[PDB]
Amino acid sequence: MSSGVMVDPDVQTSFQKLSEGRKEYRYIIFKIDENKVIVEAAVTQDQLGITGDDYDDSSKAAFDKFVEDVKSRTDNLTDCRYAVFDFKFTCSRVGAGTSKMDKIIFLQICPDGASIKKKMVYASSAAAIKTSLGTGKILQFQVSDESEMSHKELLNKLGEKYGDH
């Protein structure tokens, strides 16, 4: 655990082209390998067959089936990774109605009933990945089940944070 998790330089690079580039399009898939964070994929959903925007376009249907794929490919729930999406949802404006809002979230998945050794490495990673990005303003939530990382909950979390909770 006290191994000293570091980040692969390309991690920050992938965050640049999102934050100051595509904004809400094409996301970053990065896991822990050995003892440092690796970029597995810098892929959008709109290049694989979907259109892109979670609620704005209603591409959330993609996220709805993805949670099943998660339990299908990873057997039980032994998956752990870092996933960052700038997802475009709609916030309920107090005094008004629906208002489209786009912003970035840190998805940290830490299953309690998962492989503690490699999983606890992700706990060390939380410090490294955030410090390397120095965002200062982010919503970094800790989920463990597929249903917690579903599109409805994602919208809910990023809404309740400064909205109705």
Supply the CATH number for residue 68's domain. 3.40.20.10
Rounded CA gap, 138 and 62, in Å? 23
Question: What total number of domains does the chain contain?
Answer: 1
Provide the token pair at 114. 């998962």
Long-range contacts from 116-120, C-beta under 8 angstroms, 24+ separation: 118/32, 118/80, 119/80, 120/1
Structural domain range at position 141? 1-165
Rounded CA gap, 110 and 89, in Å? 24
Rounded CA gap, 160 and 59, in Å? 21
* Number of other residues whose CB lies within 10 A of the CB of residue 65: 9
Rounded CA gap, 37 and 29, in Å? 10
C-beta separation of 78 from 114 below 8 A: yes
Rounded CA gap, 158 and 139, in Å? 7
C-beta separation of 56 from 100 below 8 A: yes
Rounded CA gap, 114 and 147, in Å? 16
